[PDB]
Write a structure and sequence with these properties.
3 domains; binds calcium ion; 16 helices; binds a molecule of 2 linked components (NAG-NAG); six-stranded mixed beta sheet; sugar binding protein; binds magnesium ion; binds chloride ion; alpha+beta
Length: 530
Amino acid sequence: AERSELTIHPKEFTTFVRNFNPFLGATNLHTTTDFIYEPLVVFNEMHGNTPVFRLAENFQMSDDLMSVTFDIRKGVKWSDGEAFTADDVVYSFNLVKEKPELDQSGINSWVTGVEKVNDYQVKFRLSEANSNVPYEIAKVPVVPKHVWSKVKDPSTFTNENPVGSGPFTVIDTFTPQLYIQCENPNYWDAANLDVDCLRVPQIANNDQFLGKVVNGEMDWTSSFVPDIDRTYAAASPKHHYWYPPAGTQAFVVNFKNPDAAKNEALTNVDFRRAFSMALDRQTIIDIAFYGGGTVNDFASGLGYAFEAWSDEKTHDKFKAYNSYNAEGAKKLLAKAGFKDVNKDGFVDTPSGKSFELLIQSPNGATDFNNTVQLAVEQLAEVGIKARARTPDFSVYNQAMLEGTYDVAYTNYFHGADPYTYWNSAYNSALQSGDGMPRFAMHFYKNEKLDGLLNSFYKTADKQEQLEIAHGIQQIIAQDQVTIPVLSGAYMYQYNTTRFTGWWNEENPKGRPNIWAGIPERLLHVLDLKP
Ligand SMILES: CC(=O)N[C@@H]1[C@@H](O)[C@H](O[C@@H]2O[C@H](CO)[C@@H](O)[C@H](O)[C@H]2NC(C)=O)[C@@H](CO)O[C@H]1O
Ligand SMILES: [Ca+2]
Ligand SMILES: [Ca+2]
Ligand SMILES: [Cl-]
Ligand SMILES: [Mg+2]
């Protein structure tokens, strides 16, 4: 007699440290959000951000877009039996407010205050008009007041025995190499859930992963798999995958690099364009990603997923700078004044200084690693000296947060409209803060651009959104702020050996991936049956 264990892989680790604190995204385990702490609403981003109501049953914006009310579902219990109510929501937002350390999404710059209207209704007051704020609100973890009010210091609290609202709150097994997370005994949506436990094995990199997945040892994964047909697909007809289109991937350059020679090059827009034209994006896609991507030749990073949003006069004006043109790259370096003056074949800065660009991508992310090595070779052909680095994710991340890096290859989260990409990638407000992610850390700062970003949802009118879009697109393309390469894919592999009900090509219910930060994975696990 065997419980239905579902084997998932949301995040690389070399060893598991027991940490289920949903506010500490950089050091916690990646089954905490959604699976332990259910959100108020899941927005189905693949289906136009259609709201799927979970712990909330409704929300409504005020007419001036300066406040919003959430109705809380009745009958819901924490895993320890205690009732879930508006108090828990109000508490959670007050906690993040007082301790900005715990704000990983930037909610503190939208919500000025939160109040309980009654036991199942919460009101949010805004600092500024935002018709999209319910989406932002839904990113904040909601935790139980009767536990966290008694917590010491939440920013170091490891929360080893979690009390949660989600489907899997019980820590059945924990070891450095394996943990098993089982059904919440008081789960409100238990009738809808047919999986008994989440089984989470320790896997450090894509190499260790490839061995395990081809051998049929996984159920639900979202890792890069090299040569997936001959390696994994051909291993069994039970081995399936579905890779729908995802977000932008780019080389991001540090505008505040402390080295004089490097700073001179990186902050030069002719240099960023020459760098960009040296890249053979299609070769990166074919070789490093085995076809799993689309060329991104928008200087703004927009991508072909959102070409309806594109001001095509802006896109075509700067398109040439974001296509493969090695002769053009060499000519631009020459015109700009990046001349090789010490006879080694690599261009030097206008002030005569030699330099090498260190390009980083995360350890274990072999598709990104191979991308950077291909770029290093393509750059050398036009006389730009570069070297690849593959630091551990925490080191990669910290070096961006601190501004010590030169160039970083990174992907971005992908929304229902271009705002998820553009805001996270360019809003200068997101360049400061301990909880802040890496995405905005080039430290290019443009007050006009921030102004446009912060006004994107001042109205409900989508035609005025589209025009703000066009303004944003123009600013970023004009300055070639990053070097966009491709639009990636939501890599997703599923095994029909032990479970059915999977999302796929024929059943495209939403983003199918198992990563933290994909709230839809809650809704996906609810569709699975043994
Ligand atoms: C936007 C973002 O940061 N996404 C992260 C994912 O990219 C990442 O998944 C990893 O992506 C690598 C690059 O394509 C893959 O090589 C790697 O196999 C994959 N790892 C896993 C476990 O799926 C995840 C996890 O590191 O974090 C996301 O936030
Ligand atoms: Ca179900
Ligand atoms: Ca030289
Ligand atoms: Cl563009
Ligand atoms: Mg059930």
